[PDB]
Amino acid sequence: EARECVNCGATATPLWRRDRTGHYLCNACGLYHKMNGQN
Amino acid sequence: GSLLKPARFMCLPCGIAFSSPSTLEAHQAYYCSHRI
Ligand SMILES: [Zn+2]
Ligand SMILES: [Zn+2]
């Protein structure tokens, strides 16, 4: 609906977070990219 | 020759289709395994 997640595809996320590369991630997959540090 | 440029924006094994090739890159780097 909102956007296409690259890790799960869950569009029912409370908010979307964009990665530094410019990708669109959710509150889950997006958080991983932040906490993990790496890609 | 060949194709070079990918005209497909939907993974076959995964089954998840995208609307933006830019994000598809991240998809194919996680969903279809953490390949590089
Ligand atoms: Zn997600
Ligand atoms: Zn895929």
| Domain at A30, CATH number | 3.30.50.10
Please give the residue range of the domain that contains residue A10. 1-39
- DSSP summary character for residue B30: T
User: Is the Cβ–Cβ distance between A10 and A26 less than 8 Å?
Assistant: yes
Find, in chain B, the residue whose alpha carbon is nearest to that of A5: B27
Sign of the C-alpha dihedral, residues A3, B24, B18, A9? negative
* DSSP state letters, chain A: -----SSS-----S--EE-TTS-EE-SSHHHHHHHS---
What distance in Å separates the CA atoms of residue A6 and residue A16, rounded to the nearest whole number? 12
Find, in chain A, the residue whose alpha carbon is nearest to that of B17: A4
Q: From ligand 2's centre to the CA of A37, what distance in Å? A: 22
Give B2 to chain A, closest Cα distance, Å.
27
Give the method used.
Answer: NMR
Which residues of chain A make contact with B19, given a CB cutoff of 8 A?
Answer: 4
The domain tally of chain A equals 1
